[model samples]
Target: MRITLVTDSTSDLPQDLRGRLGVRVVPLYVNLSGAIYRDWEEITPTEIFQKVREGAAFPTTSQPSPEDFARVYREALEEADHVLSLHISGKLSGTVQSAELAAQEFPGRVTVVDTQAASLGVGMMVLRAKELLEEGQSLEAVLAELERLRRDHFVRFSVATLEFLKRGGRIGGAQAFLGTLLNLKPVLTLKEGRVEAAGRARGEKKAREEILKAFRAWAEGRKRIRAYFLYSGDEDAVAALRQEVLASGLPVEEALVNELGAVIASHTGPGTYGFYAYSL
Candidate 1:
């Protein structure tokens, strides 16, 4: 049986991987100045970050409509007997529901799987699903594999400042002000579909140190680790983090370098560094 894969744009699939995997990616929307733009299609994360930094006002993200998913699923059904769709966590976005709603139109032609993860975590699942599909695995088998990985896949992110969250209405202005007032740095992780405080430090450098320290412990003695360094508008920090992880001597196959993308950057802000990893 021919199988195709689908996902929303927030998965952070890299440029080259898109063509290689034969996956269809649908874009989520970001509203800036009353205009809607697709992530990585019409606007890049770097450009969105720069605009936000330059006082272009706050941006809001929207899930793709059911019709959007229908369009993509129709295209996949044309070439494949089944389509395996993995998407962002349900608690985070309505994309999964959108896909499910669309799937009803296609019936047995489509199967939607929720990774219960986001960013590169979901991307990794989609990548693996594509591999399994190529291996002639049945849709049920691939769904089982993705479900297993969903619980184990991990995503950790570090932002230099919390002001962006405050400005974007993701956090309270009062809370963000308090951090600045006390000279505290905040780190965040995806919790219940929203950014929650993971940890904090006295300063930016210390915050980064704390995050990296956790990464080392998480990857301890693993024979293999699939990891990615996701960043926004910071080449130096990305390079430094890559170097730090490599020095740990873990067998990292490839470290995908990703920009935060418009939807993610609107909430994560610029200078956000994230590490995503999962075991086979």
Candidate 2:
């Protein structure tokens, strides 16, 4: 069966890689200055940041409508026998629900998966599905592996400020720990699909150190690990973090860096960087 991979723009997979892998990305919406723009299409994280810096209201994001997913699914189904739709966490956004609603139209021809991950966390899964298909694995085998990896997935990131998170009302359990943010850098991760505090450090350097330390601790007994570094408007920070991970000598089988796109940055704000990994 010809299988196609579909993911939301929040996957943050580079355009070239997306085209090469033939992954179709359905973009979410970003509302800024009373106008709506497609994430990564009409607006960018940098432009959003610039508007905020200029004293404009903070931007808000919307998941793609079911129509958006249906159109893409229909188009993809034309060339493929089935579509594997992977998306951001359900707890984080309604993107998954939209996909699920759209999938109802395709019956067995489409499978919607909730990776419970964002950014490269979802991107990695899409890449793996493509690999499995290329390796001649059955669609059933690929779905089983995707579910297994989702259970083992981990995403940890640090933002320069929590104002955007607060504004977006996505603080989740991290709400109680906001007081500690008065002086320290805040580290956050997805807890059961919602934003929650992972740990904190006194400064940027320490914050990244804490994140890596946690990564090392998690990888101790795992036989295989894959790493993906993520940053928002901070290439140098992600580069340094990549270097640090490489120097630490973890069983990092594969590693790549990705930038948080407009959809994610709309909520996380800029100056965000961290690592996402999963064990095989």
Candidate 3:
């Protein structure tokens, strides 16, 4: 049996990438009120933001159940000796835990990896694993690559307003407003595999400056580097970051500009823009 790579639906991977990489994806659920929707496929970030902006309460997201992952695991085993299922950070979502529970049936054949990242953070890890798999690398080698990425992967997101996190219950409204009052834009990063505040900016320019500065600092001397510019419901900002990175002389293999899915947009809200970068 050959080794194959799998990831949850939250990676926000573009359709073209999925087809090219031959990576299988399993869906997670977004429970908005009484309805349930698949993350990026059925439920979009724009639609979720509209719900919040138009006066609906904070929407809650749920992880795909163990059963949800089992189906994929079993199917993968049919064609592969083992499966490496990478997923979002456990702190951010229960997808990893759910996948772990599903691996019980497959026993030694199923290996679950917690990416400790969101969106392209997870995407980059999967891409590396796919590269190794294509080279006929063993599961052990693939797993080692993923573990390395987990420690080195970094995310820096700058959002338009704090109201989104506040309204979504990720942060309180008062604190959100306080950020506004001080003309501050709170920047967050993935720390200890969880999202946490890394710094703040006094304005939009400052925010961009902060993000780029952080990128240059942490991104130095890295190889096989790829950069991703992600924004939720904000095209201009995303484009700006895209142009900035392209002009920065970084060895960007590709830069993906995508709308954050509901699960992420629910917390980031509209006008969210940031870069998630990784290296070899």
Q: Judging by TM-score against the true structure, name the best candidate.
A: 2
Listed per model in order, the count of residue pairs whose N, CA or C atoms clash below 3 Å is 0, 0, 0
Clashes of 1: 0
Model 3, residue 187: C-alpha shift (Å): 1.6
Tens digits of per-residue lDDT, candidate 1, 47-147, equal 77677778887788899999999999998888888888888878667899999999999998888887777688788888888888788888888888887
Off by over 4 Å in 3: 166-181
Candidate 2 lDDT, 34-70, residue by residue in tens: 9999887888888999999999998999999999999
- The candidate scoring highest on lDDT is 2
**Cα-based TM-score, every candidate:** 0.89, 0.96, 0.92
Q: What's the residue-level lDDT of 102 in candidate 3?
A: 96
* Candidate with better TM-score, 2 vs 3: 2
lDDT for 216 in candidate 3 is 80
Q: Is candidate 1 or candidate 2 better by lDDT?
A: 2
Candidates by TM-score, descending order: 2, 3, 1
Off by over 4 Å in 1: 166-181, 191-194
Model 3: residue 11 alpha-carbon error in angstroms: 0.9
Off by over 4 Å in 2: none
